[PDB]
Amino acid sequence: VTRYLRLKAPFAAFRPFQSGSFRSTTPVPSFSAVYGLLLNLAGIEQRQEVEGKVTLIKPKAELPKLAIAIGQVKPSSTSLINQQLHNYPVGNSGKEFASRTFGSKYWIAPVRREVLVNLDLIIGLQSPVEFWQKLDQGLKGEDEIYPIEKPDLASWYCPLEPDTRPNQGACRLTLWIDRENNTQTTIKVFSPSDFRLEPPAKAWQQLPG
RNA sequence: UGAGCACUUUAUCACCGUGUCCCCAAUCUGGAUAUUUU
């Protein structure tokens, strides 16, 4: 890796991909979300932004190549703070609903979901010099994030093989997802490793995106 | 500052009461000597 930078945030939420009627969350963000956040923070606009019923139709032909890991310093708890969020009905969709048709989003119904009390992340990116330079220009050029790479090292994550039973692992995770018919991502489960030493090469994952 | 991203936990109201007591008090004890110049 070239260098890595640290950040923290008080509140966040990471929905499982089509969790269901009742939402849920995961202790750590997905790799795809982190990749998108880093791409946007550099000021790189999305490669494709066509419009229609849906979006996110992304070929890999023109897209930066890069390798990302993930880290974690302090465990955080979870809470549930919501009572309502409307939806789009399935069924008759009778009476007025069919009468209005104004970007409908009618039939408000109650539903709850989860939030994270606190969040802090440490990992950065292994990338060529030009990409890091333009990322710095996007951050500084024409909540809070800053590089403390060498000190302040904490635990990390890594894919797990059928041995060495881990503790408090993440149930599911996403690598590269497109909102269409596909095979989604291959590996789901991940395992945390606790040691104040540089993460192993297995922790680094070369992202296809 | 980008893609899953909505539209509210929403609107009202008394604890009624009433009601407190009488009795009382002790004692004893004291002291000694001492001034002179403008």
Automatic annotation (TrEMBL):
It comes from the Bacteria. Keywords: Plasmid. This is Uncharacterized protein.
